[PDB]
Amino acid sequence: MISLIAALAVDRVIGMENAMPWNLPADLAWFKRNTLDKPVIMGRHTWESIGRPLPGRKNIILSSQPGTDDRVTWVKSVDEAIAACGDVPEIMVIGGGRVYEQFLPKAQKLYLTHIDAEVEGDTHFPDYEPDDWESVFSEFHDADAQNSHSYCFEILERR
Numbered sequence: 001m002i003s004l005i006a007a008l009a010v011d012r013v014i015g016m017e018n019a020m021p022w023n024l025p026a027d028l029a030w031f032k033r034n035t036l037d038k039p040v041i042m043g044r045h046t047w048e049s050i051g052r053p054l055p056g057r058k059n060i061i062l063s064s065q066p067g068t069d070d071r072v073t074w075v076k077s078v079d080e081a082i083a084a085c086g087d088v089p090e091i092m093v094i095g096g097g098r099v100y101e102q103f104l105p106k107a108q109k110l111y112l113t114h115i116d117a118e119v120e121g122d123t124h125f126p127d128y129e130p131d132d133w134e135s136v137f138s139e140f141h142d143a144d145a146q147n148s149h150s151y152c153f154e155i156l157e158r159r
């Protein structure tokens, strides 16, 4: 199946100027945890921000244009992207905006990081219907020495 994985600040804010407007090492770990040994579909935008494959995962990028790193796989359509995954149990969609927007409808689950920070962004997470999903997990964390904001992990499934 298909899964989305994002970290949202206040107001679904997900990025600014091609970046994540905060720094939460703790999130990094949860992300790795959740994407380890899975294929990951990402947008060219996001790809450019990462700048190198994610070990432990099949990296599939979406671009109209042609590939620019032989180490990762390129694609020109949502169905091909999906194709490229193969017969895997969970495909992970890692953003950016436009991509979330697209796979959203197709998703059966989301993995969220709710971060208590109010920041301006140029990208926000697709609006979804609270009714359609069922929160099956939550895990609160207070700000800390390294994580300057408290945040909460959560997991929803399509109702």
Ligand SMILES: NC(=O)c1ccc[n+]([C@@H]2O[C@H](COP(=O)([O-])OP(=O)(O)OC[C@H]3O[C@@H](n4cnc5c(N)ncnc54)[C@H](OP(=O)(O)O)[C@@H]3O)[C@@H](O)[C@H]2O)c1
Binding pocket: 005, 006, 007, 008, 014, 015, 016, 017, 018, 019, 020, 042, 043, 044, 045, 046, 047, 049, 062, 063, 064, 065, 075, 076, 077, 078, 094, 095, 096, 097, 098, 099, 100, 123
């Ligand atoms: N907060 C988080 O959880 C999280 C996770 C990821 C990213 N982000 C943030 O996301 C922001 C950028 O997201 P974005 O929406 O600007 O870009 P994106 O989705 O990362 O990149 C979009 C690009 O992907 C290509 N694309 C998308 N759908 C396609 C399709 N069906 N076929 C072909 N190409 C397709 C297009 O590239 P072409 O130019 O090649 O057509 C498009 O310009 C950044 O700020 C990043 O930091 C946040």
